[PDB]
Amino acid sequence: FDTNIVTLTRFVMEQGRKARGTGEMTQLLNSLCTAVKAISTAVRKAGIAKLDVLSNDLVINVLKSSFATCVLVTEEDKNAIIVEPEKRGKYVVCFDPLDGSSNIDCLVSIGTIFGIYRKNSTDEPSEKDALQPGRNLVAAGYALYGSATMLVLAMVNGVNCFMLDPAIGEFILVDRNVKIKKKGSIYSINEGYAKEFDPAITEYIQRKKFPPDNSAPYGARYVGSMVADVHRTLVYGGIFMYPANKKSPKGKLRLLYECNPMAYVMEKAGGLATTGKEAVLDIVPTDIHQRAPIILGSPEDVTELLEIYQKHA
Amino acid sequence: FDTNIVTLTRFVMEQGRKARGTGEMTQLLNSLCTAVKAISTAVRKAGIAKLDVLSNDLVINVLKSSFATCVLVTEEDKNAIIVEPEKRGKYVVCFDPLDGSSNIDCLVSIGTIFGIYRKNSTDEPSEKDALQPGRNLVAAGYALYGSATMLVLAMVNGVNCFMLDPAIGEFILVDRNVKIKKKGSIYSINEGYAKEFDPAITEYIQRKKFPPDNSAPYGARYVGSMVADVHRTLVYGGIFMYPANKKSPKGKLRLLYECNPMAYVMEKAGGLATTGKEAVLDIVPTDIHQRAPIILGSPEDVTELLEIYQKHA
Amino acid sequence: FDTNIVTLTRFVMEQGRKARGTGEMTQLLNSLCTAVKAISTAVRKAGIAKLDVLSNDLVINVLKSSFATCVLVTEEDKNAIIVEPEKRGKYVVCFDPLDGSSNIDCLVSIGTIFGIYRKNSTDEPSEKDALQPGRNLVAAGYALYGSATMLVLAMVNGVNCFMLDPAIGEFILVDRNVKIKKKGSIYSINEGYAKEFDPAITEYIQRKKFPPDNSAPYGARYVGSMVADVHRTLVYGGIFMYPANKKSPKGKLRLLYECNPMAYVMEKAGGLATTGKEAVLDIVPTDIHQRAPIILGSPEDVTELLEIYQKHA
Amino acid sequence: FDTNIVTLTRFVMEQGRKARGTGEMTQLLNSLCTAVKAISTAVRKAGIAKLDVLSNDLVINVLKSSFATCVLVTEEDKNAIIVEPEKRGKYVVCFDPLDGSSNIDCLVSIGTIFGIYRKNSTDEPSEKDALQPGRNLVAAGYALYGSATMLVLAMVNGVNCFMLDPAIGEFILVDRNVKIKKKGSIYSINEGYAKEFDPAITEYIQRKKFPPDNSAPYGARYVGSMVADVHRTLVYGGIFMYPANKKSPKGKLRLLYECNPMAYVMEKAGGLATTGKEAVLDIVPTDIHQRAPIILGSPEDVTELLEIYQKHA
């Protein structure tokens, strides 16, 4: 009866028409969604019989065959992947094909994170085309393989969420223009690293548990899988932090394919994403595998931690 | 593990690149497949609770939103449907959204038949753009909702069959360049109309049952649903006939959306399609709802009936 | 989301609770449903992925694990299968695992036919337990892998249709206490064998194409798969006929697991099943793989052919 | 296509056949599987389509139709439900239909918790039949709607995991006689309530973040859904803790259908379930909706917190 179904394709296509463009993005996101549906199906009967290597080979293949990319950066590949000339296009794509895959056995939410840049140079494609600021992303998002499979997409016009209807094998648009809440009730961080944190994070944790103005204390959640913690942060409001510890002095989370996508999504939904020292999106990278500290969330909460970072400075 | 999956999109896109074109066909067939997956899902839980009217509204919508059509001809609509200017493209499409839908209750194979022309005039779109010879089709085919859902596609380069993988919601290419057999063993026709047939059909039926050279007699099958009878004829070889009776002097089957698609498919697979008087594809139409007699099948069998039509002439 | 789902299990249990007899039967049919779902899925992705052998082995394994059978007859195995003493129960199941399996490649409907007897002896299970007349059948029916999957189940109360809801893997009751039309307008027979047809048949078909009482001729329909044509005959009406010719001298369809299951379905829905001479249900079997002619369908139609048999003898 | 599928039904039946007891139990759990599949599907398309109310009604309808229950306790209904005399059997089922349902919107895992007692009386069913200590549980477990759907079922032999194969709608055995790690490296507790935590807890958490025996600190993990964290704790190891604070004075988790099902799973897999004072399984219930603290998980970890409880009393 739902004859007017807004699929992701119908959505992405109607928009690149306003860009007065060539169609490569619609083709790209199209291919990407073939990878996303196949990984979901795989995670759903994963047990009835690694997985993140299949995953990876599926995203690289659907992206080369789309004739819309030229440099592909993977979590799994040492170097950047340059698309053969016959299959080349203008977009650069950095992705993590199955984020949080250590946790596939404990059956909790995992996902694919991706960030798409445009190559702007006249030269032959290289990893340098990929070493751009995250503020330069044309589009970015993640797919979520939880109780339902969700693709959240951020572009210049906003943040939209599409859900996989498993009956038809199509992502359907279920929420338009997701704006995050100004202030939330949840803080998300691995507190098992408490001795390794700096003075400003420890002070912020302390007042969420023991509120200064004799208020109501913050709830705590940490799924242990970045996509699940950030999607909850977007839809429910709150703060999410994976700051620098001593196992990880530059942070644990990679910049081109975990911090920049999720930060692009957050800021487009009206939140902030910072390292405590600077905006994540404005960090200029040097190595495609470099890590970054990240504190992303509802504006008033991230701002709070930013001020605890200044007194301590 | 199947990282290199040839989907219909990957197939259609790689080909329009050789046409040095604009992308409207890939978009069109893409939209069409959203309609096809949704109708399949519907026929699969059709009972757990008309259907061909939903079907129709689903194909018209996915085709308008593709920005690749301008005139749409339906079995269900009196007139041709002209696409609003903002959503217009170059292709004309004639379809039957759910062929053989009287038979949905008896649970047998049904399907969607479509034929795509190109508008070649400079004028504003009209039904006249649709009144072309079937020899002028750029592409044509059918989707089959039987035990599996099959989309058979014919274009200038050949006949290819793609199957719906229901796990991923993607049509996969399972047979490349289907050529029909020279001569087959099966004849397909509704013999309950036997008193109404002409002398040449009656003579051809007679020698399939009672072979002149003391041979082995032809088997007989007639599902009663054009898509199922023609797909069997393509994949197994044989003859299929719905010739003029007295309930139907111009035949029962419509020309722009049942006879021309199936004839385009047949001739591209190397078979023949005739009315007994002329090639179906070369019939120039006058009304978008006009019917035609059709005898389509393996070459040596159709040719046989063509000669029984000449002695009788 | 229906909170009041009526599955095949809840159904059968609500008929057997008012009996104090078998919850052993619920176990058997329940097990038969797992195999039917596992075959349906395999047929639905068949081309993307011997089918009847793996189906044979699935129906035997799921049956032996019900703890409800002791003897099993299959189309594929020459001798009966006496189930292990440890896994025994009181029922004999006779099954054709994948009817019309030559018709799989052409995507025409296929199905699973099963008759279930009760072992009416104290002795050790032997194929003589399988050798009851169909009259002695406790439950019988079929599964049709069509545009939708349907399990039709005839027991002593009547016939009930169930449909596979692919979303949850359950057979849902969609038609209760089914009864066939007294008279239909379709006849189903392979007229390629017209030459070796006996004269009762030959006369009867001319009364269909050329009505004596000048009425409309019957429509012909022959899918070529027993389950598709016996199921169309049960819902629409009309006659289905596979009589004896010489190439198949005492008929083609096997008596224990194709003619008798269909004949018990037909008679518990008020239609008739004969061989032209006697009732199928009273023929006392001598080989497990013994054949028989079969004419079934609407009571006023079987009757009209039985009186042309009375005339030639 | 596996011909030797081991479903939950074939499993349970192969353990109960070597017992001469219940095939009444197979009926119950079988019915519980229909509801679990019907809820899984609803959660998987949730956003595209009160969920816990329709889930409540589904678990009650499918349960009353098993002819295996007489008393039912639900999170949603204040009084027990004494099943009709016509539909009775010997088992009491206590169930939480949709655990952590506030977490549905954020797409984090949710689940169904069920404990099953046997009515140990001759009398008329009354909620006093529901009021056994968990020690008296015959079968207990949960369903996790995660990246995959899993039914974990603990009976007297041990714990077994089953996974929903979405293709055929059956739960397939994927792990046999499960046993938890003696000691894990993760602790799970909501530290937003750190202020009102009692001192055994507060000390124990500092031994996790700051190890006395200078070892690596434990990793924190808290999904916020009981089934996700009790299931991660069973497969990985570690401790899960919901102790009493004042806002929820005698603990938050309801004893009859959340603490006791989880506690019987944990103990039949060799882990421990306590309240800090006593074992959960021996607490004699007084209200059906009575609450309790719960600390569960690896034996060497519960032990380490039980000795800090011995210290403060």
Ligand SMILES: O=P(O)(O)OC[C@H]1O[C@@](CO)(OP(=O)(O)O)[C@@H](O)[C@@H]1O
């Ligand atoms: O159609 P092409 O040329 O590929 O480019 C479309 C451009 O418009 C944008 C706007 O954010 O996406 P979209 O296709 O959705 O409109 C860019 O991301 C993209 O580069």
Ligand SMILES: O=P(O)(O)OC[C@H]1O[C@@](CO)(OP(=O)(O)O)[C@@H](O)[C@@H]1O
């Ligand atoms: O164990 P910790 O250090 O908390 O790491 C969890 C974080 O690491 C990531 C990185 O991929 O998962 P993981 O290491 O388990 O693979 C993120 O998804 C997640 O936010």
Ligand SMILES: O=P(O)(O)OC[C@H]1O[C@@](CO)(OP(=O)(O)O)[C@@H](O)[C@@H]1O
């Ligand atoms: O890309 P556009 O401009 O839409 O046209 C492609 C042309 O090539 C053909 C060749 O048959 O299809 P295809 O896209 O598969 O290559 C025509 O049917 C079609 O008109």
Ligand SMILES: O=P(O)(O)OC[C@H]1O[C@@](CO)(OP(=O)(O)O)[C@@H](O)[C@@H]1O
């Ligand atoms: O009953 P007859 O005259 O044989 O008609 C069957 C033919 O008509 C069609 C036309 O749509 O089906 P139907 O009339 O049953 O809807 C074809 O699919 C099929 O080949």
Ligand SMILES: O=P(O)(O)OC[C@H]1O[C@@](CO)(OP(=O)(O)O)[C@@H](O)[C@@H]1O
């Ligand atoms: O080709 P004919 O002789 O008409 O056979 C049709 C009958 O044979 C069967 C026998 O099982 O099919 P098939 O040979 O194609 O396997 C039945 O399903 C069907 O009703």
Ligand SMILES: O=P(O)(O)OC[C@H]1O[C@@](CO)(OP(=O)(O)O)[C@@H](O)[C@@H]1O
């Ligand atoms: O917010 P807190 O108090 O940590 O609650 C978590 C616990 O509460 C429950 C209660 O059912 O979730 P919830 O309130 O979100 O419904 C459990 O599933 C979960 O373990």
